[PDB]
Design a protein around this motif. Sequence first.
Motif, PDB file in Angstrom:
ATOM      1  N   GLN A  24      -0.002 -11.903  -0.929  1.00 58.65           N
ATOM      2  CA  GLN A  24       0.870 -11.393   0.130  1.00 58.65           C
ATOM      3  C   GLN A  24       0.492  -9.952   0.536  1.00 58.65           C
ATOM      4  O   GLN A  24       0.732  -9.554   1.675  1.00 58.65           O
ATOM      5  N   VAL A  25      -0.087  -9.180  -0.392  1.00 57.65           N
ATOM      6  CA  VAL A  25      -0.516  -7.805  -0.160  1.00 57.65           C
ATOM      7  C   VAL A  25      -1.911  -7.607  -0.770  1.00 57.65           C
ATOM      8  O   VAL A  25      -2.312  -8.375  -1.642  1.00 57.65           O
ATOM      9  N   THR A  26      -2.618  -6.547  -0.371  1.00 60.62           N
ATOM     10  CA  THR A  26      -3.901  -6.193  -0.976  1.00 60.62           C
ATOM     11  C   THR A  26      -3.820  -4.744  -1.485  1.00 60.62           C
ATOM     12  O   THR A  26      -3.448  -3.841  -0.732  1.00 60.62           O
ATOM     13  N   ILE A  27      -4.141  -4.535  -2.762  1.00 53.74           N
ATOM     14  CA  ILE A  27      -4.175  -3.214  -3.361  1.00 53.74           C
ATOM     15  C   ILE A  27      -5.659  -2.857  -3.482  1.00 53.74           C
ATOM     16  O   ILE A  27      -6.461  -3.676  -3.920  1.00 53.74           O
ATOM     17  N   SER A  28      -6.023  -1.654  -3.063  1.00 50.67           N
ATOM     18  CA  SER A  28      -7.401  -1.182  -3.090  1.00 50.67           C
ATOM     19  C   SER A  28      -7.450   0.330  -3.397  1.00 50.67           C
ATOM     20  O   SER A  28      -6.393   0.971  -3.498  1.00 50.67           O
ATOM     21  N   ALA A  29      -8.658   0.896  -3.620  1.00 47.46           N
ATOM     22  CA  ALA A  29      -8.768   2.336  -3.879  1.00 47.46           C
ATOM     23  C   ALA A  29     -10.101   2.903  -3.435  1.00 47.46           C
ATOM     24  O   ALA A  29     -11.118   2.225  -3.520  1.00 47.46           O
ATOM     25  N   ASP A  30     -10.080   4.147  -2.934  1.00 45.26           N
ATOM     26  CA  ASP A  30     -11.261   4.910  -2.556  1.00 45.26           C
ATOM     27  C   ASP A  30     -11.277   6.058  -3.562  1.00 45.26           C
ATOM     28  O   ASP A  30     -10.641   7.086  -3.333  1.00 45.26           O
ATOM     29  N   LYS A  31     -11.938   5.858  -4.711  1.00 43.90           N
ATOM     30  CA  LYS A  31     -11.972   6.882  -5.757  1.00 43.90           C
ATOM     31  C   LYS A  31     -12.642   8.175  -5.282  1.00 43.90           C
ATOM     32  O   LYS A  31     -12.353   9.233  -5.836  1.00 43.90           O
ATOM     33  N   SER A  32     -13.485   8.108  -4.237  1.00 42.77           N
ATOM     34  CA  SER A  32     -14.172   9.290  -3.716  1.00 42.77           C
ATOM     35  C   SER A  32     -13.236  10.313  -3.062  1.00 42.77           C
ATOM     36  O   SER A  32     -13.599  11.481  -2.928  1.00 42.77           O
ATOM     37  N   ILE A  33     -12.073   9.873  -2.604  1.00 46.04           N
ATOM     38  CA  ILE A  33     -11.059  10.780  -2.069  1.00 46.04           C
ATOM     39  C   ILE A  33      -9.748  10.639  -2.881  1.00 46.04           C
ATOM     40  O   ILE A  33      -8.692  10.915  -2.335  1.00 46.04           O
ATOM     41  N   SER A  34      -9.807  10.180  -4.161  1.00 43.89           N
ATOM     42  CA  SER A  34      -8.648  10.053  -5.034  1.00 43.89           C
ATOM     43  C   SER A  34      -7.468   9.345  -4.370  1.00 43.89           C
ATOM     44  O   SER A  34      -6.335   9.790  -4.520  1.00 43.89           O
ATOM     45  N   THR A  35      -7.723   8.242  -3.628  1.00 49.13           N
ATOM     46  CA  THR A  35      -6.651   7.553  -2.911  1.00 49.13           C
ATOM     47  C   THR A  35      -6.569   6.065  -3.224  1.00 49.13           C
ATOM     48  O   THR A  35      -7.580   5.376  -3.217  1.00 49.13           O
ATOM     49  N   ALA A  36      -5.349   5.578  -3.504  1.00 45.84           N
ATOM     50  CA  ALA A  36      -5.046   4.161  -3.715  1.00 45.84           C
ATOM     51  C   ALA A  36      -4.322   3.676  -2.454  1.00 45.84           C
ATOM     52  O   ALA A  36      -3.618   4.458  -1.810  1.00 45.84           O
ATOM     53  N   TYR A  37      -4.485   2.400  -2.093  1.00 42.94           N
ATOM     54  CA  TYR A  37      -3.856   1.842  -0.899  1.00 42.94           C
ATOM     55  C   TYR A  37      -3.086   0.575  -1.200  1.00 42.94           C
ATOM     56  O   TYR A  37      -3.370  -0.111  -2.172  1.00 42.94           O
ATOM     57  N   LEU A  38      -2.111   0.271  -0.350  1.00 38.86           N
ATOM     58  CA  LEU A  38      -1.315  -0.954  -0.362  1.00 38.86           C
ATOM     59  C   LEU A  38      -1.356  -1.452   1.088  1.00 38.86           C
ATOM     60  O   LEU A  38      -1.078  -0.663   1.996  1.00 38.86           O
ATOM     61  N   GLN A  39      -1.763  -2.709   1.326  1.00 37.53           N
ATOM     62  CA  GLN A  39      -1.860  -3.208   2.697  1.00 37.53           C
ATOM     63  C   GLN A  39      -1.335  -4.629   2.878  1.00 37.53           C
ATOM     64  O   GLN A  39      -1.393  -5.447   1.963  1.00 37.53           O
ATOM     65  N   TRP A  40      -0.800  -4.894   4.085  1.00 34.62           N
ATOM     66  CA  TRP A  40      -0.265  -6.189   4.515  1.00 34.62           C
ATOM     67  C   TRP A  40      -1.028  -6.585   5.767  1.00 34.62           C
ATOM     68  O   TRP A  40      -1.224  -5.737   6.638  1.00 34.62           O
ATOM     69  N   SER A  41      -1.442  -7.846   5.879  1.00 35.22           N
ATOM     70  CA  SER A  41      -2.087  -8.314   7.104  1.00 35.22           C
ATOM     71  C   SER A  41      -1.009  -8.778   8.135  1.00 35.22           C
ATOM     72  O   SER A  41      -1.259  -8.744   9.344  1.00 35.22           O
ATOM     73  N   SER A  42       0.184  -9.198   7.664  1.00 34.50           N
ATOM     74  CA  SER A  42       1.245  -9.655   8.552  1.00 34.50           C
ATOM     75  C   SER A  42       2.625  -9.270   7.985  1.00 34.50           C
ATOM     76  O   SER A  42       3.173  -9.999   7.159  1.00 34.50           O
ATOM     77  N   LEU A  43       3.186  -8.123   8.421  1.00 38.84           N
ATOM     78  CA  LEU A  43       4.476  -7.668   7.906  1.00 38.84           C
ATOM     79  C   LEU A  43       5.641  -8.606   8.251  1.00 38.84           C
ATOM     80  O   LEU A  43       5.650  -9.229   9.302  1.00 38.84           O
ATOM     81  N   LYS A  44       6.615  -8.702   7.349  1.00 42.96           N
ATOM     82  CA  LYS A  44       7.832  -9.467   7.561  1.00 42.96           C
ATOM     83  C   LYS A  44       8.970  -8.486   7.679  1.00 42.96           C
ATOM     84  O   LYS A  44       8.878  -7.409   7.098  1.00 42.96           O
ATOM     85  N   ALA A  45      10.110  -8.872   8.289  1.00 39.37           N
ATOM     86  CA  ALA A  45      11.284  -7.993   8.308  1.00 39.37           C
ATOM     87  C   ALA A  45      11.747  -7.696   6.846  1.00 39.37           C
ATOM     88  O   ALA A  45      12.149  -6.573   6.554  1.00 39.37           O
ATOM     89  N   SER A  46      11.582  -8.665   5.920  1.00 42.99           N
ATOM     90  CA  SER A  46      11.950  -8.471   4.519  1.00 42.99           C
ATOM     91  C   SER A  46      11.047  -7.491   3.758  1.00 42.99           C
ATOM     92  O   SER A  46      11.396  -7.099   2.640  1.00 42.99           O
ATOM     93  N   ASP A  47       9.903  -7.073   4.343  1.00 49.81           N
ATOM     94  CA  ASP A  47       9.069  -6.032   3.715  1.00 49.81           C
ATOM     95  C   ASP A  47       9.683  -4.618   3.952  1.00 49.81           C
ATOM     96  O   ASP A  47       9.128  -3.640   3.439  1.00 49.81           O
ATOM     97  N   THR A  48      10.839  -4.500   4.690  1.00 49.59           N
ATOM     98  CA  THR A  48      11.529  -3.225   4.895  1.00 49.59           C
ATOM     99  C   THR A  48      11.981  -2.727   3.522  1.00 49.59           C
ATOM    100  O   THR A  48      12.806  -3.377   2.870  1.00 49.59           O
ATOM    101  N   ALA A  49      11.347  -1.630   3.041  1.00 50.86           N
ATOM    102  CA  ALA A  49      11.583  -1.089   1.702  1.00 50.86           C
ATOM    103  C   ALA A  49      10.913   0.286   1.534  1.00 50.86           C
ATOM    104  O   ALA A  49      10.092   0.687   2.366  1.00 50.86           O
TER     105      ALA A  49
END
Lengths: 151, 213, 212
Positions: free
Chosen positions: B67-92
């Motif tokens: 349902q989501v993809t977690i990824s990271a760019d260690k070169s800029i010390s950043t972690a990501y959380l991504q959705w390809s298709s948001l739902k109204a229930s993802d409001t959080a």
Amino acid sequence: VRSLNCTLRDSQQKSLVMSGPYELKALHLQGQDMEQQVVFSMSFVQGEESNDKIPVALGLKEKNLYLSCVLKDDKPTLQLESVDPKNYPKKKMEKRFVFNKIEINNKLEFESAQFPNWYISTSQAENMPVFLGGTKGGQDITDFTMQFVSS
Amino acid sequence: EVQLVQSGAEVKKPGESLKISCKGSGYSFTSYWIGWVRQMPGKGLEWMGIIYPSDSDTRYSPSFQGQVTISADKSISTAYLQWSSLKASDTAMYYCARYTNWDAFDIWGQGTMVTVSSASTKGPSVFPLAPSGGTAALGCLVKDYFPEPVTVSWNSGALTSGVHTFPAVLQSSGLYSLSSVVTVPSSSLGTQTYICNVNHKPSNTKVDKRVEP
Amino acid sequence: EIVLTQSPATLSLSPGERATLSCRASQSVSSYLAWYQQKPGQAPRLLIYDASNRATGIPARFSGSGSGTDFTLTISSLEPEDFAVYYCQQRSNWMFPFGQGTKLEIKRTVAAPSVFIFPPSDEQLKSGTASVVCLLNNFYPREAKVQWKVDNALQSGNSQESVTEQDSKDSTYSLSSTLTLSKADYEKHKVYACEVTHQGLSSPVTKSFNRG
């Protein structure tokens, strides 16, 4: 520092897997489920060396995580510890990271260099943590085999 | 100082893709696992997944796998959380947190609020709650705006005692509404000017409303 | 995998008093249990790790204990900043369940609300809608019933309430109830009334106005 990629299995042929992020567990794996096993980068480090006792450090391949021995609740304990990637691996590893790899018959034991006669151990039961044990030859398993992995 | 700083609040519509970020500082980012935690409005914490930035080894909770993809760019010390298709229930609110060998999330990001709704941005209409014992109440009704938040101050921030700005309530229309009230001496109504300053950054709306008896 | 059950859901106490919060695991696991504090409007923060160790910068009044499946968090003497939601967490292999949380709220003496009613403004009426607002100010406990009456007839479904978080200085709540009507329906009736029932009032209190 020289290192080798490898896997370890206890003498009951149980493989080691990551249980969560800072602990390992041992279980019987075979077939496709073997891909779950942890790959180590075993480094050959500085320390008191004898003919059948070789000091090594055990890091997780491509991760700045090392097995180490520390007192926790006044007991010698095995933990997985995060390290600064700029400084590791190195030949002069701190004593908590050093294990004496000992040849016993056709198997290997990993004694803590910091805590003499404490060894990397597994339980006979399935899905239990890898731990540091002060007995060798009781119910707990202290001998392993090593499998070589491609670079 | 060890810290995790997250990207700003997002307001999206269902079906849209989204990627939010978590930036580490004051420590070796590559060396610690980063977890993502969801908190729906008025609900508790739910773990979503975790990633080791060194090799991007990722583990998801079964409720979030695929349902989501977690990824990271260690070169800029950043972690990501991504959705390809948001739902109204993802409001959080979404938090990133550093996980340690103590089996705990020792450092937390400030949170990223994600609001998912088919509504589009709109500034509020501001109406007086006119003053009619020795104490009088007055206020402003800040109605039909989207998205959150609005800020309300009184007399350019000089009036703070006795002020209560209520949490917004989402109306059936998909637009928010709230009131901001203040209790003052009834004898001050003829002397003192009372103005509510309403700011809605998403629509760049700023309204100063004079509330008279 | 495992479930963590926290109790009580709401713990009501005063600054100076001792607080005990409980967390029970459905199964016993070897991972370390942690407690988190989430103050209103803020991110959670680690309080305790491995059931009894205070995290960096956590004051001595916080302690933890337990083993097996039963864990406890204790605050020896509450400070006003300690009134927050507390969560426990314990990893189960690669799953990370949290407890459902416990809200620690300030118990103070009962305080009746001051009730005020506001008619719709002429500016709003011009746009075709009428919002009548009823304000319940500085009351304790939070529980309150607000009933709208239009020409002495009970209303339902046409109003919405909003409640503030507990005041940092006097520990009271404030509440707004907004009745929304069309301009035509508003002008068809004369008396608009807000009736409040609360523990601090001997009988329900009404604030009302005659339109215009």
